[PDB]
Amino acid sequence: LMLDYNLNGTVSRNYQGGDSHQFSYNGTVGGNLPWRLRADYQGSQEQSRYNGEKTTNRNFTWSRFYLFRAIPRWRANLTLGENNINSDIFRSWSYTGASLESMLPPRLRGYAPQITGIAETNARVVVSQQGRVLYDSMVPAGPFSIQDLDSSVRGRLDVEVIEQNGRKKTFQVDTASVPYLTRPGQVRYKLVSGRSRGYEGPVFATGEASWGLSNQWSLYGGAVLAGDYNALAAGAGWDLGVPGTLSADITQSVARIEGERTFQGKSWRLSYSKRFDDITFAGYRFSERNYMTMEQYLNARYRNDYSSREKEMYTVTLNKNVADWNTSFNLQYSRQTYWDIRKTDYYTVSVNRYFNVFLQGVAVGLSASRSKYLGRDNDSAYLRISVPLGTGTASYSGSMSNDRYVNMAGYTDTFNDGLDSYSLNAGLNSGLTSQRQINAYYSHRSPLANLSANIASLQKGYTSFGVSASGGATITG
Amino acid sequence: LMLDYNLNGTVSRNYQGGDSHQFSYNGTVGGNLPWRLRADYQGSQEQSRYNGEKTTNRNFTWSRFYLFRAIPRWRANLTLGENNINSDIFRSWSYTGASLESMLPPRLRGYAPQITGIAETNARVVVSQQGRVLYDSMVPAGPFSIQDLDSSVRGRLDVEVIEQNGRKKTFQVDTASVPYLTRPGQVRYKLVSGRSRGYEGPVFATGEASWGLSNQWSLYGGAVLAGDYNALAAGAGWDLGVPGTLSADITQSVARIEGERTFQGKSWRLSYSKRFDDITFAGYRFSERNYMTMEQYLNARYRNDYSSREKEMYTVTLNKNVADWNTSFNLQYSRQTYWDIRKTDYYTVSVNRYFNVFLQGVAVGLSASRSKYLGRDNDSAYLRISVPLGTGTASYSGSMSNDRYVNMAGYTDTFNDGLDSYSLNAGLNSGLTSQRQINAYYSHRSPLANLSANIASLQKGYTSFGVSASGGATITG
Ligand SMILES: CCCCCCCCCCCC[N+](C)(C)[O-]
Numbered sequence: 001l002m003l004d005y006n007l008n009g010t011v012s013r014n015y016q017g018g019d020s021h022q023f024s025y026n027g028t029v030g031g032n033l034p035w036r037l038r039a040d041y042q043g044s045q046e047q048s049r050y051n052g053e054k055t056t057n058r059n060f061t062w063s064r065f066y067l068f069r070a071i072p073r074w075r076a077n078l079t080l081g082e083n084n085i086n087s088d089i090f091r092s093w094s095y096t097g098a099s100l101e102s103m104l105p106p107r108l109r110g111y112a113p114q115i116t117g118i119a120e121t122n123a124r125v126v127v128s129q130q131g132r133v134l135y136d137s138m139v140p141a142g143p144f145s146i147q148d149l150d151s152s153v154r155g156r157l158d159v160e161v162i163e164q165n166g167r168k169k170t171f172q173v174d175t176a177s178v179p180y181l182t183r184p185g186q187v188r189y190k191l192v193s194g195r196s197r198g199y200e201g202p203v204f205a206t207g208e209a210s211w212g213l214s215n216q217w218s219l220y221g222g223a224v225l226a227g228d229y230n231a232l233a234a235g236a237g238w239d240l241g242v243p244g245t246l247s248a249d250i251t252q253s254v255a256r257i258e259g260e261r262t263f264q265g266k267s268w269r270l271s272y273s274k275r276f277d278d279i280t281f282a283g284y285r286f287s288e289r290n291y292m293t294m295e296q297y298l299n300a301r302y303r304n305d306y307s308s309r310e311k312e313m314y315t316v317t318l319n320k321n322v323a324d325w326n327t328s329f330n331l332q333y334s335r336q337t338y339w340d341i342r343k344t345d346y347y348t349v350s351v352n353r354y355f356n357v358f359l360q361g362v363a364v365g366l367s368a369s370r371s372k373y374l375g376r377d378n379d380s381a382y383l384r385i386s387v388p389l390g391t392g393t394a395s396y397s398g399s400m401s402n403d404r405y406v407n408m409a410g411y412t413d414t415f416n417d418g419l420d421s422y423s424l425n426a427g428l429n430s431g432l433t434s435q436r437q438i439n440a441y442y443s444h445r446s447p448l449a450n451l452s453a454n455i456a457s458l459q460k461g462y463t464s465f466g467v468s469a470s471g472g473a474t475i476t477g
Numbered sequence: 478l479m480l481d482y483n484l485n486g487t488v489s490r491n492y493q494g495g496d497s498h499q500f501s502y503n504g505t506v507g508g509n510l511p512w513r514l515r516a517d518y519q520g521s522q523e524q525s526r527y528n529g530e531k532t533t534n535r536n537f538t539w540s541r542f543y544l545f546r547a548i549p550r551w552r553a554n555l556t557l558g559e560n561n562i563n564s565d566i567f568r569s570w571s572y573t574g575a576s577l578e579s580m581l582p583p584r585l586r587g588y589a590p591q592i593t594g595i596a597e598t599n600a601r602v603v604v605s606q607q608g609r610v611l612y613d614s615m616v617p618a619g620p621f622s623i624q625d626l627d628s629s630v631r632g633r634l635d636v637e638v639i640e641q642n643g644r645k646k647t648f649q650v651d652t653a654s655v656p657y658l659t660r661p662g663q664v665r666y667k668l669v670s671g672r673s674r675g676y677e678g679p680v681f682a683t684g685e686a687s688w689g690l691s692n693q694w695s696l697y698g699g700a701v702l703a704g705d706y707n708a709l710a711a712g713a714g715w716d717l718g719v720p721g722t723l724s725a726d727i728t729q730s731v732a733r734i735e736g737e738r739t740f741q742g743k744s745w746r747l748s749y750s751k752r753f754d755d756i757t758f759a760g761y762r763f764s765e766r767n768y769m770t771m772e773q774y775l776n777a778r779y780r781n782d783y784s785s786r787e788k789e790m791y792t793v794t795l796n797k798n799v800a801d802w803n804t805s806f807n808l809q810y811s812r813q814t815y816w817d818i819r820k821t822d823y824y825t826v827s828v829n830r831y832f833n834v835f836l837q838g839v840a841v842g843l844s845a846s847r848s849k850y851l852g853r854d855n856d857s858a859y860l861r862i863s864v865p866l867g868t869g870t871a872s873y874s875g876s877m878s879n880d881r882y883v884n885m886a887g888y889t890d891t892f893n894d895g896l897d898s899y900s901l902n903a904g905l906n907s908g909l910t911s912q913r914q915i916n917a918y919y920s921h922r923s924p925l926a927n928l929s930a931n932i933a934s935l936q937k938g939y940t941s942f943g944v945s946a947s948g949g950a951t952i953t954g
Pocket residue numbers: 078098099100191192193194203204205
């Protein structure tokens with residue numbers, strides 16, 4: 001019986017008084033009985049004490065836990081228990097039930113949705129989808145690129161960057177929606193049944209299939225039979241060569257909510273993907289005022305929420321490594337508009353060049369990003385020149401988050417071959433009298449157990465300490 | 478005695494009443510007596526009639542006219558009369574006097590500053606620098622790329638896009654400031670003298686030179702001796718190979734204005750350029766509160782203007798043609814900040830892909846840009862699919878200027894091999910009840926004489942007719 005723990009803990013004081021605690025954990029229990037196991041758990045506890053009020057927000061749940069078993073001979077996998085639907089045609093909601101679903105040319109499957117951004121401090125970053133916790137551990141200040149996500153992540157993700165000074169900056173990233181294509185002989189499909197979760201739960205079945213026409217083309221369809229909510233979708237997909245693959249989808253919905261009225265709508269979606277084995281992906285989507293996803297409907301029927309009616313959604317992704325002049329470029333953009341509320345443009349860019357000027361690998365990196373700090377836009381840029389000095393490396397950093405700019409000097413030293421490392425930094429925040437910053441971050445990365453602690457302190461500001469451990473153990477008595 | 482005329486004329490009516498006239502002209506007189514001639518003239522007249530008031534704004538001037546003569550044997554050219562300083566180290570002001578200045582590896586000289594943007598209507602676009610008229614003729618609605626500029630344009634340009642509906646959108650473009658480098662043996666220099674113009678005029682001399690150190694490097698300097706304004710500048714330049722060339726400059730200023738005070742300041746400037754014979758240029762500049770250019774000083778002493786104190790200026794330019802997947806990409810960006818006023822970010826992007834889907838060269842183009850419409854930001858995007866149909870080509874266009882979006886259908890036919898062409902368009906503006914749009918644009922492009930007329934009419938809107946002729950003639954009695 002396997003366990004995959006992930007822990008976080010942080011303590012901090014204010015220069016005005018307050019203490020606060022933060023402990024979070026998430027992980028997965030696995031078991032083997034052709035009957036396989038998978039239980040995802042996640043929880044957190046937060047406390048704060050000011051002049052008069054302590055506050056506490058505490059949460060725990062099994063996001064999802066189910067049994068799944070492989071079958072030799074339909075190349076299909078059966079899974080039953082509490083899960084989440086993962087579709088290449090429909091969007092996601094959580095459910096209890098079972099499902100039967102069909103390794104083949106990568107150019108047709110989905111890949112790991114690498115999330116990127118920028119942190120003012122040494123910050124804990126949590127990536128989620130719906131309520132499910134996909135990633136939440138600490139990051140050292142500066143641009144960050146989380147490439148630890150489950151091979152099967154789909155849809156758009158919710159990222160929260162909780163900074164050491166108490167500022168929560170949040171944004172959204174859209175994972176690439178790779179064309180649901182197939183090779184002529186084969187057939188891809190996904191037929192799921194059960195009742196929708198967490199709002200007993202309305203009964204629903206959903207099917208989705210991908211036919212292999214005799215050309216470099218392929219047609220797919222799917223339907224959602226939820227009763228008060230039904231949706232049908234058909235789509236055409238086309239394969240190319242190295243110039244990537246492509247596809248388009250039209251999907252209509254019928255939703256009937258009590259004494260409220262009845263909504264009808266469709267949404268068209270065009271997506272292109274040139275990744276295989278430089279990755280580039282561009283996707284588009286435009287949906288009607290009355291078109292709703294299974295999720296949208298549910299929040300509408302059970303929670304009385306009709307907010308966030310999607311209109312148009314553009315999303316571009318380019319991670320191109322020109323080994324040629326020794327520079328990598330990554331772009332993650334996602335513009336999203338609505339019928340009821342204001343547009344929401346989220347992006348993050350970075351370009352890293354490796355130089356030779358005096359000895360090897362002097363590094364200059366420029367990064368820029370925009371997220372949201374409490375409704376209002378938060379716009380950042382980061383400039384870092386790093387000089388490698390033996391097993392260590394000294395660096396200078398210039399940060400510009402909104403109207404507050406930070407200057408940083410620091411030395412980082414690595415050991416155990418890159419597994420462990422330890423860095424000390426000192427700097428100045430100005431943008432409002434200036435403050436001196438002192439900060440140290442330590443990391444240990446063994447494959448069976450990771451661990452990392454960091455301590456930070458701002459003048460007339462805050463002072464906090466945080467640890468973050470994650471590893472693998474077998475819990476069987 | 479040569480003449481290079483350029484004319485524009487437009488008439489239009491309002492749906493509420495008004496008529497208006499617009500006539501502009503600019504050109505250059507040339508003459509040969511080793512004594513060469515060059516006279517630039519420019520003028521315009523505008524009239525309007527509403528309920529009660531007609532108005533008229535009329536202007537004419539010889540921007541600049543001077544004599545210049547080549548000399549065999551110092552590979553230098555002497556020019557005297559009323560001109561404008563053009564320096565690779567200093568910024569521009571206009572002056573009466575004479576100058577002596579030093580074809581050689583392109584990687585060190587300057588190129589044609591191609592200006593780009595987007596027009597709602599069939600619009601006349603005027604490009605200028607200081608007050609001097611560099612370009613002003615009509616453009617057919619959609620993205621536009623003016624590549625007619627004098628080989629020697631330097632500094633940043635002022636672009637105004639006067640639309641057929643009466644909306645003036647304006648912005649700024651920074652021409653690439655190519656590194657003032659030289660080959661070891663040779664020496665580049667520029668020593669100018671006279672009095673500053675148009676505010677008799679303060680006396681000034683200015684010198685600038687480029688030495689050829691024995692490496693792929695090169696050092697340059699220059700000074701401005703204006704009396705109440707002095708400035709000295711030194712800079713290092715470095716040449717590479719195909720990875721372009723580079724350079725950095727530090728320049729200090731001393732300005733003394735009466736009973737006002739005395740300003741001191743410097744500004745650092747780093748510029749990289751990878752163009753020769755795909756062009757890419759990135760430049761940076763950061764100047765002190767009290768640092769002033771010769772121009773800045775003059776507006777300060779003679780016009781009592783201390784506005785627009787430059788702080789930081791970033792500028793990027795990328796025009797890369799991937800013949801490989803038959804698509805071109807052009808990016809013109811320029812962020813500019815100040816000490817006294819708000820930031821000013823101007824940009825324009827476009828990507829054009831040529832397809833094959835049914836016959837040859839079906840075209841999809843996406844363009845986006847941001848300029849200023851009366852203090853406020855004006856943000857546009859344009860989508861155009863064009864299908865070639867013999868000597869003609871039918872197209873569909875989607876425009877989005879701010880909150881007003883336009884849909885357009887149109888057929889264009891070309892003849893005389895691309896020299897002449899004629900297109901008719903019809904569309905809808907919605908963003909405020911919608912309106913039908915009818916528009917035709919004709920162009921004739923013979924090398925000795927160009928001419929173009931266009932007629933446009935919006936429902937419950939405006940209705941205008943415009944002509945634009947430009948050619949070469951010899952006026953000698
Ligand atoms: C062995 C096959 C695995 C079970 C596949 C489930 C798909 C059946 C769907 C039918 C309807 C289910 N329902 C009505 C309860 O939602």
